[PDB]
């Protein structure tokens, strides 16, 4: 069994590979989520994952897809390394105290613990990454930062170190929703297939149940995700609170605006998780043998 150090290193590497592979999906989701906030005089409107990716590439370059990528990698190395490598230690701490099989509640609690700690640790990375992903020279809003470390230095010296933890509570909420929805939905669909005999217990049942659970988690966390992105991206003073941002999104843009960038979000969640899981298991076994 892999050591906790091997687990942390493997989770960090796997998360970094997944993040670098799926980063354009993240950029597309962010650009779709901040699209209707400020009206644009430009004719460049983003629609769909492919349309958004192509629009960004052709109006502002390939590299603008990977804007804030070092912040995303730092987010992996700290936040996701912790959240994925500590999950088994926490889950053993909970279930093995009484020699228990991992219940749904045990999984929910372990995931909530690891995800909350990871969110708090890596919020600065999330702030910098979102603000770099959302910034453009085309839509009349002046970019504030030239890069990841420039954004770090500017936010730290103009908004305070607390300004690097902006949007933590919406991010915590999104993490709670994603975790609970994914686990509950996965077990519910696994049973639903097993008792209505829709699929038997090879891999495809697990895989289809994972697909539905991921989509349901993305859909349930989409309103919080949109509000989080827009609140984190906003400069100080624009929104007096996170609920203030949500209320303005509701009154000025309607309910569907709470599902902006849902398709890129779901594609990133699914692809990121698949790539990360494959690389993580491979790294754990490949290191832990040698």
């Amino acid at each position: 069994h892999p050591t906790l150090g091997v687990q942390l290193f493997s989770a960090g590497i796997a998360a970094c590979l997944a993040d670098v592979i799926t980063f354009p999906l993240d950029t597309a989701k962010v650009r779709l989520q901040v699209q209707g906030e400020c009206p644009t005089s430009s004719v460049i409107r983003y629609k769909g994952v492919l349309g958004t990716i192509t629009a960004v590439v052709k109006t502002e370059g390939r590299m603008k897809l990977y804007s804030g990528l070092p912040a995303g990698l730092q987010r992996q190395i700290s936040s996701a390394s912790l959240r994925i490598g500590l999950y088994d230690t926490v889950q053993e701490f909970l279930t093995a105290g009484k020699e228990t099989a991992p219940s749904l509640g045990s999984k929910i609690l372990a995931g909530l613990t690891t995800g909350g700690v990871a969110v708090f640790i890596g919020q600065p990375t999330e702030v910098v990454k979102v603000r770099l992903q959302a910034q453009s020279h085309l839509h009349g809003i002046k970019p504030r930062y030239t890069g990841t470390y420039n954004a770090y230095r500017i936010i730290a010296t103009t908004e305070g170190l607390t300004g690097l933890w902006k949007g933590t509570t919406p991010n915590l909420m999104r993490s709670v929703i994603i975790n609970c929805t994914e686990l509950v939905t996965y077990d519910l669909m696994k049973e639903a297939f097993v008792k209505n005999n829709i699929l038997a217990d090879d891999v495809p049942c697990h895989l289809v149940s994972a697909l539905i659970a991921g989509f349901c988690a993305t859909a349930m966390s989409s309103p919080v995700d949109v509000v989080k992105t827009r609140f984190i991206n906003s400069p100080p003073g624009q929104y007096k609170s996170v609920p203030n941002c949500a209320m303005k999104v509701f009154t000025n843009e309607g309910p569907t605006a709470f599902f902006k960038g849902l398709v890129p979000s779901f594609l990133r969640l699914g692809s990121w998780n698949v790539i990360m899981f494959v690389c993580f298991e491979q790294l754990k076994r490949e290191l832990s043998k040698s």
Partner: nanobody
Amino acid sequence: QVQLVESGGGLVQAGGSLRLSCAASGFPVMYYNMHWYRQAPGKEREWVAAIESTGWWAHYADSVKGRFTISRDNAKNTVYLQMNSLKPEDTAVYYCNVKDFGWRWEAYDYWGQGTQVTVSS
């Protein structure tokens, strides 16, 4: 009970200035973007200006940008349109507008009665 009341319009010479007011009532103006439209007889209603919920951004039609500024005071529930360097082609009825989504497929427009602005030549 959304109610928009525009005032401050009148007859001014070309090159003159005029400040239009919009008293907004029956809704929490602090959550809504506010718009100014104008319509002259023989023309379609024309979007003029838009301002954010707390005035974070303001956008103008190209025909009015630099001459017209949109301003806000949510403590008074008032939206302002300062119109400088007025041209006879600015003669129109100016309308304050709220687009409300809430639980709606499309935004629904609320308008004032409009205030007439005539620019003399």
